[model samples]
Target: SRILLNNGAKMPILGLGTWKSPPGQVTEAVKVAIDVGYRHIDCAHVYQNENEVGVAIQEKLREQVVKREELFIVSKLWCTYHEKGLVKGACQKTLSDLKLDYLDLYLIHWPTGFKPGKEFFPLDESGNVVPSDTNILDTWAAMEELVDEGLVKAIGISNFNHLQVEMILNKPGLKYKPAVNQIECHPYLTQEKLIQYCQSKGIVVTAYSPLGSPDRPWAKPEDPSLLEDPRIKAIAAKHNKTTAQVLIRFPMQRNLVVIPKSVTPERIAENFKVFDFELSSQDMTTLLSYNRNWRVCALLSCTSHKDYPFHEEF
Candidate 1:
């Protein structure tokens, strides 16, 4: 199923997340996903595997498996390129790498702006992140222009808290309102209030790490595993589905878009099977009760930035 964005563009409710997908394996993973009926593919420049993702997309197109218009491609502008002057170039680079002339949706990857440079994470002697003075509103202005220039069909944001989203909504002379707010979400981080706030304002919410991102580099061995939870496992068994399917269905049933990353062909196929079943209201409530307000991608390196979003209770 698909939902219409604020810009009147349709985005698939389920997407294939490319984060943590290795360059050597993402191409085949994407191909398998596309073959299994995934039309939305979520990617970001920092993921550093768009070239391979592009290879699969281009190959699929060449084989007449899918057309560009039938696919909803999404990418983001990294923090290093958040400066107004660098926005277009950053988007262009993603476009070039993805082998697409235009993007269906482009988001400001983060509210924090790092020192504009080649390093993904520019750090100082003290190990603190170097920051840029570029305001998010100024960066947003450049994002609006991308819409006007037709380089991207819709502009949105990622990892933004409620107040940051309000700032954009209330920006003076705002041309295009953000169509989506992508955030780290799962049973552990249900993000109820933020999702409500965005939807109330007609902005779609996209859930990343819907399976709890077990493979995240920063994850400790003792971290709470959503997939291994006995309660969730019972629900999965009740529905005759895998734990991942229950997790993905949780957000989808709430009317939010969900992207669960997987490079294994079987898991890729399994993640897409969620649409076949529905999570009962009681099961949904049980899942919702499991929220621990945890985050998989806390982005600790930039925690000291003035725009650190996690500080907010959203």
Candidate 2:
């Protein structure tokens, strides 16, 4: 259940994701999650609910339920501050907002950049898009400072494509290397080539939306169902676990980390029980074979964004 980060930090193989988890329910769920042995909790500024999550953490800490160091808390810096000097401020603001002295990891939430000192949404009056003049390299330089300045222990990227990562690495003065790239991966969208590329560069790959996130605004009935797949179902039956466990175990079996979001007390604890069993290699192959490149939220709204990096192979 222990995976070593490139920087030698020991991370539990399973973490809890807070994306789209309701604010009211998340507080109790997080406290219960801590009591039930869940260690890592993934969060972001845009989740717009860290206040509730913070309260839960404080309660646990005050009650001696779990020490601060006992949990690996993860949060992301939003895309607006991808501009050069704004990176440190963004991280500081998030740290201040979360009431934490430092972050275990800080991730750039997207490959896109935005206007500095201007608060316009990228979409225009008629819903058309407006381009920003900022460069992503400038953003990476700012993040490197957070590490140098001691605000975060590890820095990473999320929802970023291969080209964007290369752009940062090629920058001249990037003092800190991005330690990981977090994205939505499941057996359906195994992202094997991308995973291999990140691993080759020593960046750990973290899979989000591990169980199909139906709370996502983009979901439709027509989508390829990862949770309902017969193959996963069969494996779940064999192991006497739920289909969600089968999918969560699939990525863990591949030596990667997974953060599945859930607000229900039972499901949250259930997801944490992955450490108790092992998925056989034969079963692992079956899960890997389920790859259909399924992605639940692909940011299709930014199709026309000039810096919206994707599909370089296409």
Candidate 3:
């Protein structure tokens, strides 16, 4: 169990990612992980599975599967409401949708804007932004307020660069420091330096798509495959573990939080079993060398958006 964040939050190195999973399927998956000893869940408002996720959390509580404190639930604020005024409302909407009184951790999902004032994922056929409000740190001000209002335990940024983190750090009247930087990572894209950068700033890093996200429909089929990495497979063979298990365990050993998404019940159970085994220091070095910074989710969905956050050399 790693207590890496400055806020003293207990973050299990291994957790389940709930991105792009269908609503009903994801709810069941959460229940599955809970039954199998998983206490951490990675989620987001943009994922659009929070309502169903809320149901699963409720069922677990109703059935006494786990107490609220026994679990670490994370959600992100989407890009549409990047302005300060909408930030608080956006987080409240997520809290309402999640059916939770407060979030364990909340993050800004991207550094872009949405349609003029309201629509999320606003885009034209040509993938052009129609112009909109796009100031993220100012948006972060509201995230800070959530802590004051007792709406969230910790607040941070996602898919943001070191400079962005500094922006928030240097801002006057800034109430809280970001505790985590959730970014795309895997065996193929280990992102060691970014992890170093965040770690140096006293910010923890969580890796999304730890298993490579083979289910994503939009990603190119030929794009570098994480699951098929022979290096991970070889390491798994040495550990008498499956490649997926090796992948999750690798991040856990490095002190980087890992969130590998899966809606399948068996896979959910499999993902939660990573803590039993330990990866050697040498293997940790090998895994740390795997950084290509593999983040598949980009801001292209918002057609009118400029300053695409993904491509920026943060």
Best by the lDDT measure: 1
lDDT of 1 by residue, 132-212 (tens): 999899999999999999999999999999999999999999999999999998889999999999999999999998988
Per-model TM-score, in order, reads: 0.99, 0.94, 0.92
- Model 3 clash tally? 9
lDDT of 1 at 271: 93
Q: Tens digits of per-residue lDDT for model 3 on 202-268?
A: 8989988777778777878568776788887788888888889988887777678888888888888
Higher TM-score: candidate 1 or 3? 1
Where does candidate 3 have its weakest 10-residue lDDT segment?
298-307
Instruction: List where candidate 2 sits over 4 angstroms from the true fold.
Output: 116-121
Off by over 4 Å in 3: 116-118, 290-295, 299-306
Q: How many residue pairs clash in each candidate?
A: 0, 0, 9
Ranking by lDDT: 1, 2, 3
Error of 3 at 141 (Å): 0.9
Model 3 lDDT at residue 72: 88
Supply candidate 2's per-residue lDDT for 289.
85
Q: Which candidate is the best by TM-score?
A: 1
Q: Assess candidate 3 and give its TM-score to the true structure.
A: 0.92
